[PDB]
Protein backbone atom coordinates (compact mmCIF):
# COMPACT_ATOMS: atom_id res chain seq x y z
CA UNK A 1 0.00 0.00 0.00
CA UNK A 2 3.12 2.06 -0.53
CA UNK A 3 6.66 1.91 0.84
CA UNK A 4 8.56 5.01 1.99
CA UNK A 5 6.80 8.37 2.07
CA UNK A 6 8.73 11.23 3.64
CA UNK A 7 6.26 13.98 3.08
CA UNK A 8 6.71 14.06 -0.60
CA UNK A 9 3.81 11.89 -1.58
CA UNK A 10 0.97 13.67 -3.34
CA UNK A 11 -0.89 10.82 -5.01
CA UNK A 12 -1.17 7.28 -3.59
CA UNK A 13 -3.65 5.04 -5.48
CA UNK A 14 -4.54 1.99 -3.46
CA UNK A 15 -7.19 -0.70 -3.45
CA UNK A 16 -9.98 -0.26 -0.92
CA UNK A 17 -13.34 -2.03 -0.85
CA UNK A 18 -13.55 -3.09 -4.50
CA UNK A 19 -12.39 0.38 -5.55
CA UNK A 20 -9.24 2.51 -5.91
CA UNK A 21 -8.74 5.47 -3.57
CA UNK A 22 -6.20 8.27 -3.12
CA UNK A 23 -4.61 7.76 0.29
CA UNK A 24 -2.06 10.58 -0.02
CA UNK A 25 -4.02 12.77 2.34
CA UNK A 26 -4.87 15.26 -0.38
CA UNK A 27 -8.17 13.55 -1.15
CA UNK A 28 -8.06 13.40 -4.94
CA UNK A 29 -11.24 12.16 -6.62
CA UNK A 30 -10.92 8.72 -8.27
CA UNK A 31 -13.37 7.21 -10.76
CA UNK A 32 -12.89 3.59 -11.78
CA UNK A 33 -15.10 2.65 -14.68
CA UNK A 34 -16.48 -0.84 -15.32
CA UNK A 35 -13.94 -2.05 -17.90
CA UNK A 36 -11.22 -2.04 -15.26
CA UNK A 37 -10.59 -5.29 -13.37
CA UNK A 38 -9.32 -4.83 -9.79
CA UNK A 39 -8.24 -7.30 -7.16
CA UNK A 40 -7.30 -7.10 -3.48
CA UNK A 41 -3.63 -7.64 -4.32
CA UNK A 42 -3.78 -3.99 -5.60
CA UNK A 43 -3.48 -4.98 -9.28
CA UNK A 44 -5.63 -3.34 -11.98
CA UNK A 45 -6.11 -4.30 -15.60
CA UNK A 46 -6.52 -1.82 -18.46
CA UNK A 47 -8.04 -3.43 -21.57
CA UNK A 48 -8.98 -2.38 -25.08
CA UNK A 49 -12.63 -1.79 -24.15
CA UNK A 50 -14.01 1.77 -24.06
CA UNK A 51 -15.05 1.65 -20.41
CA UNK A 52 -11.63 0.35 -19.27
CA UNK A 53 -10.40 3.56 -17.68
CA UNK A 54 -9.62 5.43 -14.49
CA UNK A 55 -10.04 9.14 -14.05
CA UNK A 56 -8.20 10.78 -11.22
CA UNK A 57 -9.16 14.37 -10.54
CA UNK A 58 -6.38 15.99 -8.55
CA UNK A 59 -7.36 18.45 -5.87
CA UNK A 60 -7.62 21.95 -7.37
CA UNK A 61 -9.31 23.25 -4.21
CA UNK A 62 -6.05 23.47 -2.26
CA UNK A 63 -4.01 26.70 -2.12
CA UNK A 64 -0.68 24.89 -1.75
CA UNK A 65 0.83 24.05 -5.13
CA UNK A 66 2.88 20.95 -4.50
CA UNK A 67 4.81 20.46 -7.76
CA UNK A 68 7.14 22.89 -9.46
CA UNK A 69 10.14 21.40 -11.29
CA UNK A 70 10.86 18.32 -9.15
CA UNK A 71 8.64 15.24 -9.19
CA UNK A 72 8.55 11.46 -9.47
CA UNK A 73 6.12 8.75 -10.56
CA UNK A 74 6.28 5.12 -9.47
CA UNK A 75 4.36 1.91 -10.23
CA UNK A 76 4.61 -1.77 -10.91
CA UNK A 77 3.62 -3.03 -14.34
CA UNK A 78 3.12 -6.31 -16.16
CA UNK A 79 3.23 -6.18 -19.92
CA UNK A 80 2.06 -9.11 -21.99
CA UNK A 81 4.39 -10.76 -24.51
CA UNK A 82 4.07 -10.02 -28.22
CA UNK A 83 1.84 -12.32 -30.21
CA UNK A 84 4.15 -14.23 -32.57
CA UNK A 85 1.92 -13.46 -35.60
CA UNK A 86 1.53 -9.81 -34.55
CA UNK A 87 5.13 -8.68 -34.25
CA UNK A 88 4.77 -5.87 -36.82
CA UNK A 89 1.93 -4.14 -34.96
CA UNK A 90 3.68 -4.80 -31.64
CA UNK A 91 6.86 -3.15 -32.89
CA UNK A 92 5.24 -0.15 -34.62
CA UNK A 93 2.01 0.83 -32.86
CA UNK A 94 2.58 3.10 -29.87
CA UNK A 95 -0.21 3.44 -27.32
CA UNK A 96 -0.69 5.74 -24.35
CA UNK A 97 -1.51 4.07 -21.02
CA UNK A 98 -1.49 7.06 -18.65
CA UNK A 99 -2.19 10.63 -19.69
CA UNK A 100 -2.02 13.83 -17.64
CA UNK A 101 -2.59 16.98 -19.72
CA UNK A 102 -3.87 20.46 -19.04
CA UNK A 103 -3.55 23.32 -21.54
CA UNK A 104 -1.13 21.48 -23.87
CA UNK A 105 1.24 20.77 -20.99
CA UNK A 106 1.75 17.75 -18.71
CA UNK A 107 3.14 14.25 -18.91
CA UNK A 108 2.36 10.84 -20.31
CA UNK A 109 3.33 7.24 -20.08
CA UNK A 110 3.10 5.20 -23.29
CA UNK A 111 4.22 1.85 -24.67
CA UNK A 112 5.52 0.78 -28.03
CA UNK A 113 6.15 -2.93 -28.12
CA UNK A 114 9.02 -3.72 -25.75
CA UNK A 115 9.54 -0.05 -24.96
CA UNK A 116 7.96 2.03 -22.21
CA UNK A 117 8.01 5.78 -22.75
CA UNK A 118 7.93 8.80 -20.43
CA UNK A 119 7.07 12.10 -22.14
CA UNK A 120 7.30 15.63 -20.67
CA UNK A 121 5.55 18.64 -22.15
CA UNK A 122 6.43 21.99 -20.56
CA UNK A 123 4.11 24.97 -20.22
CA UNK A 124 5.11 26.17 -23.73
CA UNK A 125 4.30 22.74 -25.19
CA UNK A 126 7.94 21.87 -25.77
CA UNK A 127 8.40 18.11 -25.61
CA UNK A 128 11.04 15.69 -24.36
CA UNK A 129 11.02 11.90 -23.87
CA UNK A 130 13.00 9.15 -22.13
CA UNK A 131 12.42 5.41 -22.45
CA UNK A 132 13.41 1.97 -21.20
CA UNK A 133 13.48 -0.85 -23.72
CA UNK A 134 13.97 -4.50 -22.84
CA UNK A 135 15.40 -7.19 -25.04
CA UNK A 136 12.99 -9.38 -27.03
CA UNK A 137 15.71 -11.86 -27.97
CA UNK A 138 16.60 -13.24 -24.49
CA UNK A 139 16.32 -16.99 -23.93
CA UNK A 140 14.63 -16.03 -20.66
CA UNK A 141 13.50 -12.43 -20.10
CA UNK A 142 13.34 -10.79 -16.67
CA UNK A 143 10.71 -8.37 -17.96
CA UNK A 144 8.36 -9.87 -20.51
CA UNK A 145 4.95 -10.57 -18.87
CA UNK A 146 6.58 -10.42 -15.43
CA UNK A 147 5.84 -7.76 -12.76
CA UNK A 148 8.54 -5.18 -12.52
CA UNK A 149 9.02 -1.88 -10.77
CA UNK A 150 9.26 1.46 -12.60
CA UNK A 151 10.28 4.77 -11.10
CA UNK A 152 10.54 7.99 -13.06
CA UNK A 153 12.27 11.02 -11.57
CA UNK A 154 12.44 14.58 -12.92
CA UNK A 155 14.41 17.70 -12.06
CA UNK A 156 15.59 20.87 -13.92
CA UNK A 157 18.26 18.94 -15.84
CA UNK A 158 17.35 15.25 -16.11
CA UNK A 159 14.50 12.78 -16.59
CA UNK A 160 15.54 9.37 -15.27
CA UNK A 161 13.97 5.93 -15.46
CA UNK A 162 14.75 3.38 -12.79
CA UNK A 163 13.81 -0.27 -13.20
CA UNK A 164 13.68 -2.51 -10.10
CA UNK A 165 15.69 0.09 -8.21
CA UNK A 166 18.42 0.46 -10.84
CA UNK A 167 19.01 3.48 -13.08
CA UNK A 168 18.46 2.43 -16.70
CA UNK A 169 17.77 5.61 -18.67
CA UNK A 170 18.48 9.32 -18.55
CA UNK A 171 17.54 12.22 -20.81
CA UNK A 172 18.90 15.74 -20.45
CA UNK A 173 15.97 18.17 -20.39
CA UNK A 174 17.71 21.50 -19.80
CA UNK A 175 16.01 22.74 -22.96
CA UNK A 176 12.52 22.41 -21.45
CA UNK A 177 11.22 24.28 -18.40
CA UNK A 178 8.56 23.27 -15.85
CA UNK A 179 5.48 21.27 -16.65
CA UNK A 180 1.92 22.13 -15.51
CA UNK A 181 1.05 18.96 -13.63
CA UNK A 182 -2.29 19.51 -11.83
CA UNK A 183 -4.47 18.12 -14.66
CA UNK A 184 -6.77 15.08 -14.70
CA UNK A 185 -5.04 11.73 -14.82
CA UNK A 186 -6.50 9.28 -17.30
CA UNK A 187 -5.52 5.60 -17.06
CA UNK A 188 -6.61 4.19 -20.40
CA UNK A 189 -5.08 2.42 -23.34
CA UNK A 190 -5.09 4.94 -26.23
CA UNK A 191 -3.65 4.19 -29.70
CA UNK A 192 -3.90 1.75 -32.62
CA UNK A 193 -4.10 -1.22 -30.26
CA UNK A 194 -5.06 -4.82 -30.90
CA UNK A 195 -8.43 -5.79 -29.41
CA UNK A 196 -6.51 -8.28 -27.28
CA UNK A 197 -4.07 -5.72 -25.82
CA UNK A 198 -3.98 -5.20 -22.05
CA UNK A 199 -1.74 -3.98 -19.26
CA UNK A 200 -1.66 -4.75 -15.52
CA UNK A 201 -0.54 -2.10 -13.02
CA UNK A 202 -0.13 -1.75 -9.27
CA UNK A 203 0.80 0.81 -6.59
CA UNK A 204 0.63 3.95 -8.73
CA UNK A 205 2.20 6.86 -6.83
CA UNK A 206 3.29 10.47 -7.47
CA UNK A 207 5.87 12.41 -5.43
CA UNK A 208 6.65 16.18 -5.47
CA UNK A 209 10.39 15.59 -5.18
CA UNK A 210 13.14 13.96 -7.25
CA UNK A 211 13.51 10.60 -5.52
CA UNK A 212 17.05 9.50 -4.69
CA UNK A 213 18.25 6.12 -5.97
CA UNK A 214 18.62 5.13 -2.33
CA UNK A 215 14.95 5.92 -1.72
CA UNK A 216 13.78 4.12 -4.85
CA UNK A 217 15.72 1.04 -3.92
CA UNK A 218 14.18 1.01 -0.45
CA UNK A 219 10.69 1.39 -1.89
CA UNK A 220 11.45 -1.45 -4.32
CA UNK A 221 12.20 -3.82 -1.42
CA UNK A 222 9.26 -2.72 0.75
CA UNK A 223 6.72 -3.13 -2.09
CA UNK A 224 8.28 -6.46 -3.00
CA UNK A 225 7.84 -7.85 0.51
CA UNK A 226 5.31 -10.64 1.02
CA UNK A 227 4.81 -13.51 3.46
CA UNK A 228 3.88 -15.66 0.46
CA UNK A 229 6.09 -16.93 -2.29
CA UNK A 230 5.56 -15.81 -5.89
CA UNK A 231 5.29 -17.62 -9.19
CA UNK A 232 7.49 -16.87 -12.27
CA UNK A 233 5.27 -13.91 -13.32
CA UNK A 234 5.42 -12.42 -9.82
CA UNK A 235 1.85 -13.28 -8.64
CA UNK A 236 1.24 -15.14 -5.34
CA UNK A 237 2.24 -18.80 -5.46
CA UNK A 238 -0.86 -21.03 -5.07
CA UNK A 239 -1.75 -24.57 -3.94
CA UNK A 240 -3.68 -26.77 -6.38
CA UNK A 241 -2.50 -24.81 -9.39
CA UNK A 242 -0.79 -26.41 -12.39
CA UNK A 243 2.79 -25.14 -12.81
CA UNK A 244 5.74 -25.78 -15.13
CA UNK A 245 9.10 -25.65 -13.29
CA UNK A 246 11.93 -23.21 -14.03
CA UNK A 247 15.42 -23.27 -12.58
CA UNK A 248 17.16 -19.90 -12.05
CA UNK A 249 20.56 -21.63 -12.02
CA UNK A 250 19.75 -23.54 -15.21
CA UNK A 251 17.50 -21.27 -17.26
CA UNK A 252 17.31 -23.42 -20.38
CA UNK A 253 16.83 -26.67 -18.49
CA UNK A 254 13.46 -28.40 -17.81
CA UNK A 255 12.44 -31.65 -16.04
CA UNK A 256 10.99 -34.72 -17.73
CA UNK A 257 10.11 -38.09 -16.24
CA UNK A 258 12.61 -40.55 -17.71
CA UNK A 259 11.03 -43.17 -19.95
CA UNK A 260 12.57 -46.21 -18.26
CA UNK A 261 13.50 -44.99 -14.78
CA UNK A 262 11.55 -43.36 -11.91
CA UNK A 263 13.72 -40.26 -12.03
CA UNK A 264 13.50 -36.80 -13.56
CA UNK A 265 15.99 -36.21 -16.37
CA UNK A 266 16.88 -32.68 -17.36
CA UNK A 267 16.41 -31.57 -20.99
CA UNK A 268 17.09 -28.37 -22.95
CA UNK A 269 14.19 -26.01 -23.66
CA UNK A 270 13.04 -25.81 -27.25
CA UNK A 271 13.07 -22.30 -28.72
CA UNK A 272 11.11 -19.94 -30.97
CA UNK A 273 10.88 -21.79 -34.25
CA UNK A 274 9.14 -19.54 -36.79
CA UNK A 275 11.91 -17.32 -38.24
CA UNK A 276 10.98 -13.75 -37.40
CA UNK A 277 14.20 -11.74 -37.09
CA UNK A 278 12.95 -9.46 -34.32
CA UNK A 279 12.37 -12.15 -31.69
CA UNK A 280 13.87 -15.02 -29.75
CA UNK A 281 12.82 -16.85 -26.55
CA UNK A 282 12.94 -20.31 -25.01
CA UNK A 283 9.62 -22.13 -24.53
CA UNK A 284 8.17 -22.00 -20.99
CA UNK A 285 5.21 -24.36 -21.18
CA UNK A 286 7.27 -27.58 -21.28
CA UNK A 287 8.39 -30.44 -19.05
CA UNK A 288 6.13 -32.04 -16.43
CA UNK A 289 3.08 -30.14 -15.13
CA UNK A 290 3.64 -29.87 -11.40
CA UNK A 291 1.10 -29.07 -8.73
CA UNK A 292 1.70 -28.12 -5.10
CA UNK A 293 -0.45 -29.79 -2.41
CA UNK A 294 -0.89 -28.65 1.20
CA UNK A 295 0.36 -31.06 3.82
CA UNK A 296 -2.30 -30.81 6.53
CA UNK A 297 -8.53 -20.59 4.77
CA UNK A 298 -6.95 -19.76 1.42
CA UNK A 299 -4.83 -21.42 -1.26
CA UNK A 300 -1.77 -19.14 -1.03
CA UNK A 301 1.64 -20.74 -0.49
CA UNK A 302 3.62 -19.15 2.35
CA UNK A 303 7.26 -19.39 3.39
CA UNK A 304 8.05 -22.37 5.71
CA UNK A 305 4.84 -24.17 4.63
CA UNK A 306 5.11 -27.96 4.44
CA UNK A 307 4.07 -29.30 1.04
CA UNK A 308 3.83 -32.18 -1.38
CA UNK A 309 5.37 -31.55 -4.81
CA UNK A 310 3.25 -33.49 -7.25
CA UNK A 311 3.02 -33.70 -11.04
CA UNK A 312 0.77 -35.27 -13.62
CA UNK A 313 1.85 -38.45 -15.35
CA UNK A 314 -0.72 -38.95 -18.05
CA UNK A 315 -4.00 -39.08 -16.18
CA UNK A 316 -2.57 -39.86 -12.76
CA UNK A 317 -1.16 -37.48 -10.14
CA UNK A 318 2.33 -38.64 -9.08
CA UNK A 319 4.68 -37.37 -6.37
CA UNK A 320 8.34 -36.38 -5.78
CA UNK A 321 10.15 -38.29 -3.00
CA UNK A 322 13.64 -38.77 -1.63
CA UNK A 323 15.00 -42.22 -0.78
CA UNK A 324 15.80 -42.14 2.93
CA UNK A 325 19.24 -43.60 2.76
CA UNK A 326 21.58 -41.72 0.50
CA UNK A 327 25.23 -41.58 1.35
CA UNK A 328 26.45 -39.47 -1.52
CA UNK A 329 26.52 -35.68 -1.59
CA UNK A 330 23.57 -35.71 -3.93
CA UNK A 331 21.05 -38.24 -5.22
CA UNK A 332 18.36 -38.48 -7.90
CA UNK A 333 14.82 -37.83 -6.71
CA UNK A 334 12.26 -40.67 -6.92
CA UNK A 335 9.16 -39.95 -9.02
CA UNK A 336 6.28 -42.32 -8.44
CA UNK A 337 2.56 -42.66 -7.67
CA UNK A 338 1.21 -41.23 -4.41
CA UNK A 339 2.21 -43.58 -1.66
CA UNK A 340 3.22 -44.10 1.94
CA UNK A 341 6.45 -45.85 2.67
CA UNK A 342 8.87 -45.62 5.57
CA UNK A 343 11.71 -45.93 3.06
CA UNK A 344 11.00 -42.53 1.41
CA UNK A 345 10.54 -38.95 2.56
CA UNK A 346 7.74 -36.99 0.90
CA UNK A 347 7.65 -33.81 2.95
CA UNK A 348 9.05 -30.60 1.51
CA UNK A 349 9.37 -27.27 3.30
CA UNK A 350 9.19 -24.44 0.81
CA UNK A 351 11.83 -21.77 1.54
CA UNK A 352 12.99 -18.26 0.68
CA UNK A 353 16.66 -17.82 1.54
CA UNK A 354 17.22 -14.72 -0.62
CA UNK A 355 16.94 -11.47 1.36
CA UNK A 356 16.57 -9.38 -1.79
CA UNK A 357 13.38 -9.42 -3.92
CA UNK A 358 13.16 -12.50 -6.09
CA UNK A 359 10.63 -14.83 -7.66
CA UNK A 360 12.82 -17.88 -6.85
CA UNK A 361 12.07 -20.21 -3.99
CA UNK A 362 13.83 -23.25 -2.57
CA UNK A 363 12.59 -26.71 -1.64
CA UNK A 364 13.89 -28.41 1.53
CA UNK A 365 13.45 -32.07 2.38
CA UNK A 366 13.25 -32.83 6.11
CA UNK A 367 12.62 -36.04 8.10
CA UNK A 368 9.48 -34.78 9.81
CA UNK A 369 7.95 -31.37 10.16
CA UNK A 370 9.13 -31.67 13.75
CA UNK A 371 12.83 -32.48 13.32
CA UNK A 372 15.59 -29.94 13.16
CA UNK A 373 17.63 -32.21 10.84
CA UNK A 374 17.94 -31.10 7.21
CA UNK A 375 18.23 -33.78 4.53
CA UNK A 376 18.94 -31.62 1.51
CA UNK A 377 17.67 -29.21 -1.12
CA UNK A 378 16.03 -29.99 -4.44
CA UNK A 379 18.32 -28.94 -7.28
CA UNK A 380 19.95 -30.07 -10.50
CA UNK A 381 23.13 -32.16 -10.44
CA UNK A 382 25.47 -33.40 -13.17
CA UNK A 383 26.45 -36.96 -13.90
CA UNK A 384 29.25 -37.99 -16.23
CA UNK A 385 28.02 -41.30 -17.60
CA UNK A 386 30.93 -41.90 -19.90
CA UNK A 387 34.22 -40.37 -18.85
CA UNK A 388 34.59 -37.06 -17.07
CA UNK A 389 34.13 -35.04 -20.24
CA UNK A 390 32.81 -31.58 -19.29
CA UNK A 391 30.71 -31.30 -22.46
CA UNK A 392 29.22 -34.82 -22.32
CA UNK A 393 26.96 -35.31 -19.36
CA UNK A 394 23.46 -36.06 -18.03
CA UNK A 395 21.77 -33.65 -15.64
CA UNK A 396 19.15 -34.88 -13.17
CA UNK A 397 16.41 -33.65 -10.82
CA UNK A 398 18.21 -34.28 -7.49
CA UNK A 399 18.25 -33.76 -3.74
CA UNK A 400 21.54 -32.27 -2.59
CA UNK A 401 23.45 -31.74 0.63
CA UNK A 402 25.86 -29.33 -1.07
CA UNK A 403 23.19 -26.66 -1.62
CA UNK A 404 22.52 -26.68 2.14
CA UNK A 405 25.76 -24.80 2.85
CA UNK A 406 25.65 -22.80 -0.39
CA UNK A 407 22.38 -21.04 0.49
CA UNK A 408 23.96 -19.79 3.71
CA UNK A 409 26.35 -17.41 1.86
CA UNK A 410 25.60 -13.67 1.69
CA UNK A 411 24.77 -12.04 -0.48
CA UNK A 412 22.50 -14.88 -1.63
CA UNK A 413 23.68 -16.81 -4.65
CA UNK A 414 20.83 -16.07 -7.10
CA UNK A 415 22.27 -18.52 -9.60
CA UNK A 416 22.37 -21.67 -7.49
CA UNK A 417 20.75 -24.66 -9.21
CA UNK A 418 18.47 -25.07 -6.16
CA UNK A 419 16.60 -21.88 -7.06
CA UNK A 420 13.20 -22.72 -8.52
CA UNK A 421 10.32 -20.72 -9.98
CA UNK A 422 6.86 -21.92 -10.96
CA UNK A 423 5.22 -21.04 -14.27
CA UNK A 424 1.46 -21.25 -14.72
CA UNK A 425 -0.23 -20.71 -18.09
CA UNK A 426 -0.88 -16.99 -18.39
CA UNK A 427 -2.81 -15.11 -21.06
CA UNK A 428 0.15 -12.72 -21.36
CA UNK A 429 2.42 -15.50 -22.62
CA UNK A 430 1.68 -17.46 -25.77
CA UNK A 431 4.11 -19.69 -27.63
Amino acid at each position, epitope marked *: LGSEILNNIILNLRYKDNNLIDLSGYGAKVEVYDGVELNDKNQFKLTSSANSKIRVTQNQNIIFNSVFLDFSVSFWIRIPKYKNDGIQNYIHNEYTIINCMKNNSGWKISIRGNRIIWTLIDINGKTKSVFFEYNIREDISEYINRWFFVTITNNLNNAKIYINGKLESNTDIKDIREVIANGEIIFKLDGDIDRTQFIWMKYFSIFNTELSQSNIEERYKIQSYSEYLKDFWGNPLMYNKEYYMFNAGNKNSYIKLKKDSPVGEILTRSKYNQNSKYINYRDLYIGEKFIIRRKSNDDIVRKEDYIYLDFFNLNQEWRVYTYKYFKKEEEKLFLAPISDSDEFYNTIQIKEYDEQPTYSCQLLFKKDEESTDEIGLIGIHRFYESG*I*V*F*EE*YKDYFCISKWYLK*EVKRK*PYNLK*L*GCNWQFIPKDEGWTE
Partner: nanobody
Amino acid sequence: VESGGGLVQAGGSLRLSCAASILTYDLDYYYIGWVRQAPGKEREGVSCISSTDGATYYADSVKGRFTISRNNAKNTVYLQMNNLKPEDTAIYYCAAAPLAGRYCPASHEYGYWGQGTQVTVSS
Protein backbone atom coordinates in the same frame (compact mmCIF):
# COMPACT_ATOMS: atom_id res chain seq x y z
CA VAL B 1 43.24 -11.92 -20.79
CA GLU B 2 45.36 -15.07 -21.00
CA SER B 3 49.10 -15.23 -21.33
CA GLY B 4 51.91 -17.74 -21.18
CA GLY B 5 51.21 -19.69 -24.32
CA GLY B 6 53.76 -20.64 -26.97
CA LEU B 7 55.65 -23.54 -28.55
CA VAL B 8 56.64 -26.50 -26.45
CA GLN B 9 58.48 -29.71 -27.15
CA ALA B 10 56.89 -32.99 -26.03
CA GLY B 11 56.68 -33.56 -23.22
CA GLY B 12 57.74 -30.35 -21.55
CA SER B 13 55.86 -27.92 -19.39
CA LEU B 14 54.02 -24.64 -19.71
CA ARG B 15 52.21 -22.34 -17.28
CA LEU B 16 49.29 -20.24 -18.43
CA SER B 17 47.98 -17.31 -16.45
CA CYS B 18 44.93 -15.11 -16.57
CA ALA B 19 44.10 -11.77 -15.04
CA ALA B 20 40.59 -12.76 -14.08
CA SER B 21 39.55 -9.55 -12.35
CA ILE B 22 37.79 -9.05 -15.63
CA LEU B 23 35.28 -11.81 -16.48
CA THR B 24 34.26 -11.68 -12.81
CA TYR B 25 33.12 -8.11 -12.22
CA ASP B 26 29.47 -9.28 -12.48
CA LEU B 27 29.74 -12.35 -10.26
CA ASP B 28 29.79 -12.75 -6.46
CA TYR B 29 30.23 -16.51 -6.79
CA TYR B 30 31.82 -18.18 -9.76
CA TYR B 31 33.80 -20.93 -11.37
CA ILE B 32 36.87 -19.87 -13.31
CA GLY B 33 37.70 -22.47 -15.91
CA TRP B 34 39.98 -23.25 -18.84
CA VAL B 35 38.45 -24.29 -22.14
CA ARG B 36 40.56 -25.14 -25.19
CA GLN B 37 39.79 -25.53 -28.88
CA ALA B 38 41.89 -27.51 -31.38
CA PRO B 39 41.77 -26.46 -35.06
CA GLY B 40 39.25 -29.03 -36.33
CA LYS B 41 37.36 -29.62 -33.11
CA GLU B 42 34.64 -28.47 -30.72
CA ARG B 43 35.54 -26.60 -27.51
CA GLU B 44 36.85 -28.84 -24.73
CA GLY B 45 36.56 -28.00 -21.05
CA VAL B 46 39.79 -28.93 -19.32
CA SER B 47 39.58 -27.60 -15.77
CA CYS B 48 37.93 -25.17 -13.33
CA ILE B 49 38.19 -23.84 -9.78
CA SER B 50 35.47 -22.32 -7.54
CA SER B 51 35.74 -18.81 -6.09
CA THR B 52 34.00 -20.30 -3.11
CA ASP B 53 36.32 -22.81 -1.44
CA GLY B 54 38.88 -23.46 -4.17
CA ALA B 55 37.48 -26.84 -5.18
CA THR B 56 39.19 -28.05 -8.37
CA TYR B 57 37.91 -30.29 -11.16
CA TYR B 58 39.67 -31.89 -14.15
CA ALA B 59 38.73 -33.59 -17.41
CA ASP B 60 39.86 -37.23 -17.60
CA SER B 61 41.95 -36.20 -20.60
CA VAL B 62 44.21 -33.99 -18.47
CA LYS B 63 44.00 -35.79 -15.12
CA GLY B 64 47.40 -36.00 -13.37
CA ARG B 65 49.00 -33.62 -15.89
CA PHE B 66 47.15 -30.34 -15.35
CA THR B 67 46.73 -28.39 -12.10
CA ILE B 68 44.66 -25.25 -11.79
CA SER B 69 45.30 -22.72 -9.00
CA ARG B 70 44.46 -19.18 -7.92
CA ASN B 71 46.49 -16.43 -6.27
CA ASN B 72 43.40 -14.67 -4.77
CA ALA B 73 45.29 -11.59 -3.68
CA LYS B 74 46.23 -10.70 -7.25
CA ASN B 75 43.09 -12.49 -8.46
CA THR B 76 45.19 -14.36 -11.00
CA VAL B 77 44.40 -17.87 -12.18
CA TYR B 78 47.13 -20.35 -13.27
CA LEU B 79 47.12 -23.53 -15.37
CA GLN B 80 50.18 -25.80 -14.99
CA MET B 81 50.41 -28.18 -17.97
CA ASN B 82 52.94 -31.01 -17.56
CA ASN B 83 54.06 -33.67 -20.05
CA LEU B 84 52.29 -31.95 -22.96
CA LYS B 85 51.33 -34.05 -25.93
CA PRO B 86 50.35 -32.91 -29.42
CA GLU B 87 46.67 -33.55 -28.50
CA ASP B 88 47.05 -30.59 -26.11
CA THR B 89 47.71 -28.26 -29.05
CA ALA B 90 44.98 -25.61 -29.12
CA ILE B 91 43.94 -22.09 -28.26
CA TYR B 92 43.33 -21.98 -24.50
CA TYR B 93 40.68 -19.67 -23.09
CA CYS B 94 40.13 -18.58 -19.55
CA ALA B 95 36.43 -18.14 -18.71
CA ALA B 96 34.04 -17.45 -15.83
CA ALA B 97 30.57 -18.78 -15.00
CA PRO B 98 28.07 -18.53 -12.15
CA LEU B 99 28.51 -21.05 -9.36
CA ALA B 100 25.36 -23.06 -10.25
CA GLY B 101 26.08 -26.61 -9.09
CA ARG B 102 28.84 -28.75 -7.61
CA TYR B 103 30.43 -29.46 -10.99
CA CYS B 104 32.42 -27.75 -13.71
CA PRO B 105 30.45 -25.60 -16.17
CA ALA B 106 30.00 -26.91 -19.70
CA SER B 107 31.57 -24.70 -22.40
CA HIS B 108 28.22 -23.14 -23.35
CA GLU B 109 27.58 -22.17 -19.71
CA TYR B 110 30.62 -19.88 -19.42
CA GLY B 111 29.57 -16.25 -19.59
CA TYR B 112 32.75 -14.25 -19.97
CA TRP B 113 35.71 -15.22 -22.14
CA GLY B 114 39.32 -14.07 -22.58
CA GLN B 115 40.85 -13.76 -26.04
CA GLY B 116 42.74 -17.04 -25.75
CA THR B 117 46.44 -17.92 -25.95
CA GLN B 118 47.91 -20.24 -28.55
CA VAL B 119 49.58 -23.39 -27.29
CA THR B 120 51.50 -25.57 -29.74
CA VAL B 121 53.17 -28.90 -29.03
CA SER B 122 55.55 -30.28 -31.69
CA SER B 123 57.76 -33.32 -32.34
